[PDB]
A paper describes a structure:
Mycobacteria synthesize intracellular polymethylated polysaccharides (PMPS) of 6-O-methylglucose (MGLP) and of 3-O-methylmannose (MMP), both proposed to sequester and protect newly formed fatty-acyl CoA chains in the cytoplasm, thus modulating fatty acid (FA) metabolism and indirectly the lipidic cell envelope. MMP is composed of a linear chain of 11 to 14 units of α-(1→4)-linked 3-O-methyl-D-mannose (3-O-MeMan), blocked in the reducing end by a methyl aglycon, and with an unmethylated mannose at the nonreducing end. Using a combination of MMP purification and chemoenzymatic syntheses of intermediates, we identified the biosynthetic mechanism of MMP, relying on two enzymes that we characterized biochemically and structurally: a previously undescribed α–endomannosidase that hydrolyses MMP into defined-sized mannoligosaccharides that prime the elongation of new daughter MMP chains by a rare α-(1→4)-mannosyltransferase. In this elegant mechanism, MmpH serves as the recycling enzyme that hydrolyses mature MMP into defined-size smaller oligomannosides that are, in turn, substrates for ManT and MeT1 activities for further processing into new daughter MMP chains.
The structure of recombinant ManT from M. hassiacum was determined at 2.75 Å resolution from monoclinic (space group C2) crystals containing two molecules in the asymmetric unit. ManT belongs to the GT4 family of retaining glycosyltransferases and displays the typical GT-B fold, consisting of two Rossmann domains connected by a linker. Most of the C-terminal domain could be modeled in both molecules, while the N-terminal domain was almost complete only in molecule A (hereafter, the structure of molecule A is described, unless noted). Accordingly, the N- (Met1-Val209 and Trp390-Cys411) and C-terminal (Asn227-Phe388) domains of ManT display a core formed by parallel β-strands (β1-13) alternating with connecting α-helices (αA-O) and form a deep crevice at the inter-domain interface. In PimA and MshA, this role is played by Glu282 or Glu324, respectively, that establish a bidentate contact with oxygens O2’ and O3’ of GDP-Man (in PimA) or of UDP-GlcNAc (in MshA). This signature residue is also conserved in ManT (Glu321) and its critical role in catalysis is underscored by the complete lack of activity of the Glu321Ala ManT variant.
Numbering used by the authors: -2 to 67, 77 to 90, 93 to 152, 166 to 233, 239 to 266, 270 to 408
Write the structure that this text describes.
């Protein structure tokens, strides 16, 4: 009962990454809105828009992977400066030093996919420990920084009784790789601000939107072929001559408009102004654009790639599912959906309901508190 004291740990918290910062920013605000007191412990990159009701404690580390630059006065033995990726291992160690000073000041210690050895020391100090695993890094597809730290993560997550993952696709890939118990896992997805992301009663005719491997090339041929029959327009949200010179080759530089660095408000207006959102294999473990499109009442055309059929409702409810590499299938389903005015409304109404029913940040925060209480009950 009362305001729970929660320590939210995140070794990295980039403002725009789906996990790390966005997860930390939205979860902290909603936990504080529920009435609990949240204190976030973060390292570089430090978070940005945290709620004033949320306190931030900087855990400094040598950010040798800084964007401007890739030193004799290093103060801690945790500083490894090993060119032989120790940041998750070192963050959990430095967090154990701060957690020892506040042994009775926190009810739960929640981890944001750090999974370091120092977290096991925090649980040894009496802290109930919960860890959120967004994406199992055991997927060393690029093998065909160095992923030696993931061997430490699987040994830690296997001993944290309450584990949080965002989708069943990430849960199954954790069962296969991390060898974690199934009871150990609690699937709680990511949410969206259903107040900010909502229909706005004005949709431009024949306007598609896509937010960003990335199958954007397949969508670019779709809008290129759709131009002859329809006044199609693509609002592409990504930062980009680069590889996307397809815009020049297809002559679609006029109907394709690129935006980047948009705030959540600017994105919500654009995402609600479009008649359809396309998610072509845009799977970073969890599709925040799909949730943000459903919340806006915008029907989706997505690929059958991982958690997209799970996040998006069944085929024919919130979206139409297509085969990823198939350019022509994507082109036929888009045009047939764009030529149907009754289907754009039905899928959009069902997408708003599901977003409100399933993917609201408040519900995500409420389900997280439930996982918190399970770790408290075992202490």
């Amino acid at each position: 009962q009362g305001a729970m004291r929660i320590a939210l740990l995140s070794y990295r918290s980039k403002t725009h990454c789906g996990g790390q910062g966005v997860y930390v920013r939205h979860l902290s605000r909603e936990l504080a809105e529920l009435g609990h007191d949240v204190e976030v412990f973060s390292g570089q990159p430090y978070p940005e828009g945290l709620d004033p009701r949320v306190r931030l404690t900087k855990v400094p580390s040598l950010d040798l992977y800084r964007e401007p630059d890739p030193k004799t006065s290093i103060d801690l033995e945790e500083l490894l400066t090993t060119w032989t990726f120790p940041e998750p291992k070192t963050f959990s160690l430095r967090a154990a030093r701060v957690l020892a000073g506040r042994r009775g000041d926190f009810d739960v210690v929640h981890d944001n996919q750090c999974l370091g050895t120092g977290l096991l020391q925090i649980a040894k100090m009496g802290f109930p420990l919960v860890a959120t695993v967004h994406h199992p890094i055991t997927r060393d597809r690029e093998v065909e920084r160095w992923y030696g730290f993931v061997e430490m993560q699987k040994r830690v997550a296997r001993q944290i009784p309450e584990l949080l993952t965002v989708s069943s696709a990430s849960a199954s890939d954790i069962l296969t790789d991390f060898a974690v118990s199934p009871e150990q896992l609690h699937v709680v997805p990511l949410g969206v601000d259903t107040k900010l992301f909502q229909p706005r009663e004005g949709r431009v005719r024949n306007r598609i939107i896509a937010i960003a491997l990335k199958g954007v090339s397949h969508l670019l041929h779709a809008v290129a072929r759709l131009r002859v029959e329809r006044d199609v327009e693509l609002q592409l949200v990504t930062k980009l001559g680069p590889t996307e010179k397809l815009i020049a080759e297809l002559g679609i530089s006029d109907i394709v408009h690129t935006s980047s660095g948009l705030s959540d408000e600017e994105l919500a207006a654009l995402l609600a102004s479009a008649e359809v959102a396309c998610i072509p294999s845009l799977y970073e473990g969890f599709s925040l654009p799909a949730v943000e499109a459903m919340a806006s009442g915008t029907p989706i055309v997505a690929s059958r790639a991982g958690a997209l059929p799970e996040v998006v409702g069944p085929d024919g409810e919130c979206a139409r599912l297509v085969t990823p590499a198939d350019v022509d299938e994507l082109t036929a389903v888009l045009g047939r959906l764009l030529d149907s005015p009754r289907e754009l409304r039905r899928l959009g109404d069902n997408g708003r309901r599901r977003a409100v029913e399933v993917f609201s940040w408040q519900s995500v925060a409420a389900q997280t508190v439930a996982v918190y209480e399970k770790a408290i009950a075992r202490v």
